[PDB]
Amino acid sequence: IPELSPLVTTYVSLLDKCLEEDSNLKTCRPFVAVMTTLCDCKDKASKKFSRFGIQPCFICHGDAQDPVCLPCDHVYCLRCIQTWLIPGQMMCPYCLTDLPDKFSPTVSQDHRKAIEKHAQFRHMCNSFFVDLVSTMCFKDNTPPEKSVIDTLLSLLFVQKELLHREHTKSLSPFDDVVDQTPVIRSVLLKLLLKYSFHEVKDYIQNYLTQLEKKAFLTEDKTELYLLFISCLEDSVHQKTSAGCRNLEQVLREEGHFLRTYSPGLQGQEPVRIASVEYLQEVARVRLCLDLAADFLSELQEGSELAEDKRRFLKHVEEFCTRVNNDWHRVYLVRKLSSQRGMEFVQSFSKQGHPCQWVFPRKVIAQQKDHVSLMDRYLVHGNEYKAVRDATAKAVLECKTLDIGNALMACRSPKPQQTAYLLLALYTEVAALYRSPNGSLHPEAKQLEAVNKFIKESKILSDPNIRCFARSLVDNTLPLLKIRSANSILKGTVTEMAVHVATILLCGHNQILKPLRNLAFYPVNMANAFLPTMPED
Amino acid sequence: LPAINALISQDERISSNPVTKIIYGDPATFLPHLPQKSIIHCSKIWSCRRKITVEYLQHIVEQKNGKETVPVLWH
Ligand SMILES: [Zn+2]
Numbered sequence A: 001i002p003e004l005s006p007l008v009t010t011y012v013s014l015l016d017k018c019l020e021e022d023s024n025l026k027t028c029r030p031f032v033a034v035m036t037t038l039c040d041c042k043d044k045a046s047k048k049f050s051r052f053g054i055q056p057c058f059i060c061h062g063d064a065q066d067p068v069c070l071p072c073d074h075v076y077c078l079r080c081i082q083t084w085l086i087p088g089q090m091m092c093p094y095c096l097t098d099l100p101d102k103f104s105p106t107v108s109q110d111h112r113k114a115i116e117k118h119a120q121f122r123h124m125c126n127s128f129f130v131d132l133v134s135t136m137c138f139k140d141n142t143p144p145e146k147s148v149i150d151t152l153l154s155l156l157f158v159q160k161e162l163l164h165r166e167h168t169k170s171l172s173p174f175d176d177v178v179d180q181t182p183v184i185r186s187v188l189l190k191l192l193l194k195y196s197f198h199e200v201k202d203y204i205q206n207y208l209t210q211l212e213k214k215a216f217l218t219e220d221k222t223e224l225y226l227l228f229i230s231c232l233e234d235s236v237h238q239k240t241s242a243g244c245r246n247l248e249q250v251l252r253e254e255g256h257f258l259r260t261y262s263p264g265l266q267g268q269e270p271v272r273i274a275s276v277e278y279l280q281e282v283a284r285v286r287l288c289l290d291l292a293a294d295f296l297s298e299l300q301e302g303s304e305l306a307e308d309k310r311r312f313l314k315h316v317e318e319f320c321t322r323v324n325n326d327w328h329r330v331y332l333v334r335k336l337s338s339q340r341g342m343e344f345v346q347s348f349s350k351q352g353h354p355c356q357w358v359f360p361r362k363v364i365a366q367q368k369d370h371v372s373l374m375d376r377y378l379v380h381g382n383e384y385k386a387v388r389d390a391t392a393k394a395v396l397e398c399k400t401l402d403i404g405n406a407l408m409a410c411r412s413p414k415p416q417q418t419a420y421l422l423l424a425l426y427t428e429v430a431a432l433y434r435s436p437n438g439s440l441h442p443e444a445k446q447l448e449a450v451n452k453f454i455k456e457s458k459i460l461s462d463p464n465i466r467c468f469a470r471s472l473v474d475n476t477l478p479l480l481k482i483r484s485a486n487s488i489l490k491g492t493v494t495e496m497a498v499h500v501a502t503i504l505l506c507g508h509n510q511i512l513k514p515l516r517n518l519a520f521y522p523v524n525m526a527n528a529f530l531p532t533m534p535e536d
Numbered sequence B: 001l002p003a004i005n006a007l008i009s010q011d012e013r014i015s016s017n018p019v020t021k022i023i024y025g026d027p028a029t030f031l032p033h034l035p036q037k038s039i040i041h042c043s044k045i046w047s048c049r050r051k052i053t054v055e056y057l058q059h060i061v062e063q064k065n066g067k068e069t070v071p072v073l074w075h
């Protein structure tokens, strides 16, 4: 927009002449000066743009779309003016002026262009304002003054004016902007938290009280608390990672903290009190539990923990058996599962491993040793489940018609139907074989049932499907014998293999033809252009 | 992913295991030795979150059309 260069060069000179005497942006005076400079620069820019400062709609407090020009030179939303001027209030709410005829005169050449220019200018101003407050106020490790922190925190509010009240702005030093939803950002919180936690407790506590008193009186404060905990834990993570420190000193620091953790669970508990000290404490214990989860994963993968990390794990176990807040144990087990998987905690849910202390008391008392694996094939949904349940029922009994009846009572024709049938067969045989109690169940006069079903049902009597079925039913298929050693990814790799084999067999698509050639005709792929390889 | 996670969590041969409840999407209120309901002790708060890694940044930059918006970070 080549229509603001002279004014902004004048403002460049103005900010230069007011910057020599205070070349320290960390205090309040230059922040206030530059805020006023940006504000009156926006005002003068709008004045030069669109005939002395076009204002937002008075009702929604935001920019007006499809502008309608009142005789008193007022810009209101077309929706707001159409839903507000229809009853017996034919008068401009701002200056109290009666509109003669109707909201008919609209301008399609002037107001919209000025509005878009104002939006662009305000976007750049706000963006580099938050850029400066992130940079100029945070050049070094020295915390800024209290006054500038107070000003930047109070800038967010749109407090009571003549008429919703008490919104929250995205660091905009201007007033012609609103969000008609109280939303709390974390950029100011994060910027405050980059400093040491000891020197910013008052500011974050004041902001918390302000948002609890005017933004989140009675609402879902759980999201707010988890957001603040995440921000605090990210801040301490950055402080630990960026700083020049080893692992043994932080290990002993965390061990001492856990040993010196006074419970204090009754202080900020009941309904409303959430001290920033308690948020720091919960973030710290969550980080400690994440470290313990990593140590347990390493112990499962490898040898002992060099007698030092074992001390940290012992302190964690003493903490868990000392405090009754099992929510921390739930967080620890969730982190362990997210790091490795469910089979990790299933192996840890055995009957005497020296890690049962990481599990609650009721989770081990009534857990049997028949804890199996789940079928990860539920991606289909509502139809693979039915056919697999019918297949399991046919496995339990000798009748084999239930699976066919369920198959013929569904949509998703022959390709995906055969995929479902073969996958259910594989899942049933794998579940029977892996479980030692029911080993070789189809061979107990039940393989004749499935064989008669294959001979009777022509929905899968394809020679390739027939050979796959006969290989899979008697466990002669060369995928089960992967002879892995980790005993964790053996089943996963085998099930990837069997699922891709079933997909290729049942995928009768042109793109799947080369994949079929690779997975079933290797002799023809002798000296062939194998994909996903580097080229010069 | 949430839909398949919820459906798999409801499978009626692993849900019998109490371990998968405190793991695969069931609030831990069913554990008797628990503190009372608290605004800070919500089930969502005590859940697990991700660890931001540059490969996740790669996913964000490729999935949000970083070819022309922010290509320098992409490279
Ligand atoms: Zn007016």
Ligand SMILES: [Zn+2]
Pocket: A057, A058, A059, A060, A061, A062, A063, A064, A076, A077, A078, A080
């Ligand atoms: Zn409006």
